[PDB]
Amino acid sequence: MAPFEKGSAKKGATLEKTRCLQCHTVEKGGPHKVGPNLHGIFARHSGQAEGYSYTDANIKANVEWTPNNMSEYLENPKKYIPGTKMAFGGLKKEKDRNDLVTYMKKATK
């Protein structure tokens, strides 16, 4: 894991498009896909998107989404919420996670 620090929103956007856009939307009103829509993610806890069928794992994990919570989850999702159906290896590079989270914090308003 690793302490969140501000990154490049611009590079965070490129990291979303190529690594997240396939399974998630982020724009308000965006449709769910394989993954929930992520708008307001930092306004709520895990498994709270109305309209999406979550695993018991994600729902009951009760995570309070925040920048360092997002960073540690994205390093290894399946280690953070065991049982999650999110097929994502993870992002090893602190810098890539700080770039992505910094973009998410702006686009999920």
Binding site for ligand HEC (CB under 6 A): 19-20, 22-24, 34-36, 41, 46-49, 54-55, 57-58, 74, 84-88, 100
Instruction: Let me know: does 81 contact 64? Beta carbons within 8 Å.
Output: no
Per-residue DSSP letter, 31: P
- Residue 33 beta carbon to ligand HEC: minimum distance, rounded to whole angstroms: 8
Q: Among the residues of the chain, which ranges form H helices? A: 9-19, 56-61, 67-75, 77-80, 94-107
Closest CB to ligand HEC among residues 3, 21: 21
- Residue 53 beta carbon to ligand HEC: minimum distance, rounded to whole angstroms: 8
- Residue 38 beta carbon to ligand HEC: minimum distance, rounded to whole angstroms: 6
